[PDB]
Design a protein around this nucleic acid. Sequence first.
DNA 1: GGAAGCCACATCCTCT
DNA 2: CAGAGGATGTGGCTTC
Lengths: 128, 104
Amino acid sequence: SMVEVLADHPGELVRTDSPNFLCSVLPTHWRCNKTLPIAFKVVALGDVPDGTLVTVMAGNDENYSAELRNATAAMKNQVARFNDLRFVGRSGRGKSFTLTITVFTNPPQVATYHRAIKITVDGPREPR
Amino acid sequence: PIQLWQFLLELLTDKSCQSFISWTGDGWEFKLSDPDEVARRWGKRKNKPKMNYEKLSRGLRYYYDKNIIHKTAGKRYVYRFVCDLQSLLGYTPEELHAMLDVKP
DNA sequence: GGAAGCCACATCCTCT
DNA sequence: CAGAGGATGTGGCTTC
């Protein structure tokens, strides 16, 4: 199931700490408030009825809860396609945010993507 | 390192520049009667020959959030410092006006 | 000293 | 045109 899905559309999906969900690979370091190159997606291996809401939160030791934009998406054919997700808050020098994905089924489910992305004011920048 | 609002504040406290930038007489509200001249001088002070009013005003718009300067809606070229200038200058707007013979 | 962060624009550009 | 704000790229500075 998971093996076939990872092979389905190779290289772009990564594992969450939850065996029933997978998500898009995020850049290692990105500019705060800048649009992501690849639209962030959450994929459900088990069955999640269409319409189910999905949100993401980002945070770590410096920023317990980071300001985001468009952090809400709806599941469709087992995929939650976030339309232009963005990280506004900063994660701190040499540190990365940890993403907490909440799939609003009844009961709710939560999948974690540890040390997923570093967000700074400049973002990846050419050496001076 | 000099900032746009600091620069505008200099021009506004030098009576020689009153022909192109001046206080309106209402609090800390001011007007760039000759936007191009302010732009040219701002360009010269930063060493940006291409500087014009369209780009200097973009600079002013970033101040809307930082609560430094706001726009006076409906009045062309008119803005108003909304930060605590009295505190920073040690003069109320009425005293500063008088030091500059500001005509409302 | 340099790499990595933060800031304040300078430049364009879309839209009202 | 003036004016709001979004998207990007730079030089100056401060922090590790």
